[PDB]
């Protein structure tokens, strides 16, 4: 047997060692732990060993034995292990040296005892709770450790039971503790009032925190426990932290009685007075306290914020009527104000969620907002000074609260911002960071003031902001202010729409800033330009009073000098902006010529190049010619993005030549793959060519996805596109096939697929079999083709299901293999598309009726789908898709118990004639689960399948039965009567 002293060195080399010595001791300590019969030697280690880490590891070996193979043991092993553990815990509670220096070992010992109670209590241990309470009076050390036993028991029964045990087993344990709680609460209340050991008091409170997660309410409001928590235990910093968490849980408990209301007001009153006298007063600067991080100050301040907001969000109304409670109400809120100035973002999100709850109520509920006028006045400054750049989610919350506060009192919000702006001009609070946050605040409340107050406010802010730029020296300083002016003017469109002369000046200024070489200014100028265009499109398309032409024509005609020094991506944004304006023109001929004038420069460059490139070409080996082409197409993509169906005239001007260019670029990529190998696909020259193809496809996808005239799409667009892209995809090596081809065909099929049945057939024939072979050797290679492959099969199965009926039988068999192949992916997008295609497919076969194809489908593939779904359900490696797996399985089972499958699913040669599909299904399933899970008894599989089939029309219950099956296959000996739970 075991050389225990050798063990105590293996474990010490592992925990305290280093290098390869630790790595080898690692792999042998695992081998000792996962030996199936090492639990038999836990007898020796727990009693002979001198190393607590070995006693911890051995208790680990016991826990796996207890949770998964308990009921397989001969009975007297079950009581030899039980009596042991009970004896070891008692033994470690009298040795005051082991009880204070080996906490890890005693907690691990209590957990192992709780694992036994889950298996044996109370049906085979009815004396446990009365016995545990007699032992509490014998020793203070035992009383404390019994509180650890009870805390861990409530945790495993109410807080972590739903995933780990069956519904019947968990309900049994919950009922057992509920019947025995009056006894536990008597002992817990005695310890709390008679003191006095702090380590015993904290262990009692930490277990009371667990009880509050469910115990009835009468135990809390109809005893003296609330005044104990709200007074006696708030004074000592040992019990304060856990007491605060208990009063937090009480503020969420299971309320009409007029006396429960006074108790709810009472413990809140006591708690905050203790905070005032024993921790810190209401005027203390909690920002500095949190920043100093002394002791548990940060944790306490985090718990105070959680307690205040929780109680205030539920019971605020209890304090707003009575005038004796007014000081209590606003003092609690002044603590929140002080907590809100702590620079710790996760905490700030906690208080900001409550402020939202508050200011929404004041904006809607009558006769409330006058109470919190000074609270709201402070809250205004707190948020203006912490405005973030527009986490994106935190800004929307900061804006929502600030907008509510402006409605509650416009005048105070206006002066705080003007005062904060003046302190920027005099220079006391001047900073790049401080002027940016102030602008974001001034921009966020846009549209909440009245139109004429907003008018006077905007001009005041803009006027004084301009003097700031005049007064600063240096570009770094002037660029920061110039950016903030443009941000503000862009944020107030309702002001720009009513004063055309000012709007005309801003745009000419943005055009000016586009020739600025400084960093970020051109990006700021373009972002603000398109931002102003989306909200004031109409004022560029009409002839503004006292000018000769729509301002769009002025923008268009000198577009080349305006965009002369931008980067291509910035130029594409500009063209997209002009496309927004042109779509506002609802006269067709007037819109189509604005489109012609806008596209003039890229149309000119496109024409030469098609010319001097068709006739040649080789020019497309030019690095520079490829870049010129890509940016011409990208400019078309930008304008088509914002114009949609109105883009069609420009598309026809370039469509056929674009598809020809697509063909030519497809040749050269194939040529340089042949001349230099597969590594050519990585070279810059070929990557520039693939960009042209991807950008051409993107332009065609962008249009069709937004097209309105669908007859034009089918008549002129689809058939030249399919000839250009499908054959080139099919006859290229897999490492040169563009996955965007699949994405383009998905968009085509999704919008016009019902009108092109022969086009769908040719899409399947060209991409199905050759792409399936790219992705059916592993789950790794070609992640892009993988995702797009199943997006295409999904929409084809939704829009043109007849395309799968014209597949040869060998090809249809490949379609089913690909659907099951998708089940086994862990990639989230592939797996949910896979289960969807299966579910959409059985409904496609169902609505066909009693026809040879439907019958043969059930004969060939029904049980394949039943067993492939059962495999991903029960292997613990696909638990992200449990919902879709259960639903697909339910549709499969219900199909048989509704006699929608007319053919028998079996071969006449294998069972008496006249046997119903229901009976054979229960037999196929019974055999399948027995071979896959041999440790299950025959009664388990029979009762599970009995419950599973009689519940195939109730999803929530069905899911519960599958979850119960997933727990019992993790152990040995589960009770088959657990499937009668519903």
């Amino acid at each position: 047997d075991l050389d225990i002293a050798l063990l105590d060195q293996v474990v010490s080399t592992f925990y305290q060692g280093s290098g390869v010595q630790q790595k080898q001791a690692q792999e042998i300590l695992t081998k000792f732990q996962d030996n199936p019969d090492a639990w038999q030697k836990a007898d020796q280690i727990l009693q002979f060993s001198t190393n607590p880490q070995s006693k911890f590891i051995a208790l680990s070996i016991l826990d796996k034995l207890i949770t998964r193979k308990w009921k397989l043991l001969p009975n007297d092993h079950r009581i030899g292990i039980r009596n042991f553990v009970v004896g070891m815990i008692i033994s470690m509670c009298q040795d005051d040296e082991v009880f204070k220096t080996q906490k890890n070992l005693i907690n691990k010992s209590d957990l192992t005892l709780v694992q036994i109670l889950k298996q044996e209590w109370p049906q085979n241990w009815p004396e446990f709770i009365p016995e545990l309470i007699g032992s509490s009076s014998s020793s203070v050390n035992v009383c404390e450790n019994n509180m650890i036993v009870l805390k861990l028991l409530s945790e495993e029964v109410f807080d972590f039971s739903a995933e780990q045990m069956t519904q019947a087993k968990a309900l049994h344990l919950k009922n057992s503790m509920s019947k025995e709680f009056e006894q536990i609460f008597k002992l817990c209340f005695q310890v709390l009032e008679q003191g006095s050991s702090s380590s015993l008091i904290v262990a009692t409170l930490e277990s009371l925190l667990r009880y509050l997660h469910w115990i009835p309410y009468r135990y809390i409001y109809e005893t003296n426990i609330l005044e104990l928590l709200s007074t006696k235990f708030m004074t000592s910093p040992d019990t304060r932290a856990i007491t605060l968490k208990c009063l937090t849980e009480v503020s969420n408990l299971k309320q009409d009685n007029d006396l429960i209301k006074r108790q709810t007001v009472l413990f809140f009153q006591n708690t905050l007075q203790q905070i005032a006298t024993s921790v810190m007063p209401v005027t203390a600067d909690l920002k500095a306290t949190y920043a100093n991080a002394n002791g548990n100050d940060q944790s306490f301040l985090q718990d105070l914020a959680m307690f205040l907001t929780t109680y205030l969000a539920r019971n605020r109304a209890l304090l707003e009527s009575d005038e004796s409670l007014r000081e209590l109400l606003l003092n609690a809120h002044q603590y929140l104000i002080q907590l809100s100035k702590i620079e710790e973002r996760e905490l700030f999100k906690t208080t900001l969620d409550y402020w939202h709850n508050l200011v929404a109520d004041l904006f809607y509920e009558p006769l409330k907002k006058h109470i919190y006028e000074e609270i709201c006045s402070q809250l205004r400054l707190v948020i203006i000074e912490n405005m973030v750049r527009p986490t994106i989610q935190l800004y929307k919350s900061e804006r929502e609260v600030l907008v509510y506060l402006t409605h509650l009192n416009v005048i105070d919000t206006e002066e705080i911002m003007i005062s904060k702006l003046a302190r920027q001009i005099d220079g006391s609070e001047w900073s790049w960071h401080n002027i940016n946050t102030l602008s974001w605040a001034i921009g966020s409340i846009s549209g909440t003031m009245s139109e004429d107050t907003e008018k006077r406010f905007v001009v005041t802010v803009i006027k004084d902001l301009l003097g700031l730029c005049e007064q600063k020296r240096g570009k770094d300083n002037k660029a920061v202010v110039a950016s903030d002016i443009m941000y503000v003017v862009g944020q107030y469109p309702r002001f720009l729409k009513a004063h055309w002369n000012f709007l005309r000046t801003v745009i000419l200024k943005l055009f000016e800033f586009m020739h600025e070489t400084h960093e970020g200014v051109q990006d700021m100028a373009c972002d603000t330009f398109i931002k102003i265009v989306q909200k004031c499109k109409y004022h560029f398309v009409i002839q503004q009073p006292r000018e000769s032409e729509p301002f769009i024509q002025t923008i268009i005609r000198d577009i080349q000098k305006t965009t002369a020094d931008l980067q291509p991506q910035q130029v594409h944004t500009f063209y997209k902006a002009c496309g927004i304006i042109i779509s506002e023109e609802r006269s067709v001929a007037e819109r189509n010529r604005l489109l012609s004038d806008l596209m003039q420069l890229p149309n000119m460059a496109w024409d030469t190049i098609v010319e001097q490139s068709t006739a040649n070409p080789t020019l497309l080996l030019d690095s520079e010619t490829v870049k010129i082409i890509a940016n011409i197409i990208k400019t078309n993509v930008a304008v088509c993005t914002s114009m949609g169906a109105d883009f069609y005239p420009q598309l026809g001007h370039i469509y056929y030549n674009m598809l020809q260019l697509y063909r030519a670029v497809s040749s050269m990529i194939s040529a340089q793959v042949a001349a230099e190998g597969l590594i050519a696909t990585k070279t810059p020259k070929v990557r520039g060519l693939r960009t042209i193809k991807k950008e051409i496809l993107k332009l065609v996808e962008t249009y069709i996805s937004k097209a309105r005239n669908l007859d034009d799409v089918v008549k002129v667009l689809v058939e030249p596109l399919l000839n250009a892209v499908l054959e080139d995809y099919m006859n290229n090596v897999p490492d040169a096939r563009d996955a965007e081809v699949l994405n383009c065909m998905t968009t085509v099929v999704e919008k016009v697929g019902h009108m092109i049945p022969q086009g769908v057939i040719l899409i399947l024939q060209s991409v199905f079999e050759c792409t399936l072979d790219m992705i059916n050797k592993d789950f790794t290679e070609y992640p892009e083709h993988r995702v797009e492959f199943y997006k295409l099969l999904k929409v084809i199965n939704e829009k043109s299901f007849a395309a799968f009926l014209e597949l040869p039988p060998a090809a249809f068999k490949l379609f089913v293999d690909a659907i099951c192949w998708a089940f086994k992916h862990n990639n989230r997008d592939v797996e949910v598309n896979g289960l969807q295609i299966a579910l959409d497919l059985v409904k496609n076969i169902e609505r066909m009726g009693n026809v040879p194809f439907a019958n043969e489908f059930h004969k060939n593939y029904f049980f394949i789908f039943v067993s492939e779904t059962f495999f991903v359900l029960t292997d613990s490696d696909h638990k992200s898709g449990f919902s879709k797996q259960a639903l697909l399985l339910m549709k499969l089972i219900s199909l048989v118990y509704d006699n929608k499958i007319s053919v028998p699913l079996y071969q006449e040669a294998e069972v008496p004639q006249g046997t119903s599909n229901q009976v054979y299904l229960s037999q196929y399933l019974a055999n399948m689960l027995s071979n896959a899970f041999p440790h299950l008894t025959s009664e388990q599989i029979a009762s599970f399948l009995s419950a599973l089939t009689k519940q195939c029309k109730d999803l929530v219950v069905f899911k519960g039965t599958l979850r119960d099956f997933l727990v019992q296959i993790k152990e040995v000996g589960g009770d088959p009567t657990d499937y009668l739970f519903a």
Partner: peptide
């Protein structure tokens, strides 16, 4: 109307 403001912003500059 506010051409007083429009001419100030028209003067906004970043260089010098």
């Amino acid at each position: 109307n506010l051409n007083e403001l429009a001419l100030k912003l028209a003067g906004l500059d970043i260089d010098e």
